[PDB]
Write a sequence for this structure.
């Protein structure tokens, strides 16, 4: 990540956050903690890495 | 930790960070989180005691 990054795709339905469009991560190091959150949501730890 | 300090060690092999010389964790609490990272690197969260 950076270089060729993530492409994060939630499929329709319950959003990860906001408008559900696929999120991308430039952040060089990164680690992704995401849970399905009862209001039909996928939590994402904001800006983080090692 | 604090008090009697830690010693993290990188000896030859791959560098933890930078020069691989042993990095010493002073701080009272600490959380040691490192990976073996394909650029031969062991990255640990700075600060992030418990």
């Amino acid at each position: 990540w950076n270089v060729n990054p993530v492409t994060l795709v939630a499929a329709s339905g319950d959003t990860i956050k906001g408008s559900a469009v696929p999120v991308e991560i430039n952040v060089r190091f990164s680690d992704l903690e995401l849970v399905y959150c009862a209001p039909g949501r996928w939590e994402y730890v904001k800006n983080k890495q090692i």
About this structure: The two ends of chain B are 12 Å apart (CA to CA). The CA atoms of residues 11 and 20 of chain B lie 7 Å apart. Chain B touches chain A at residues 33-35, 37, 43-45 (CB under 8 Å). Chain B has no helices and no strands.
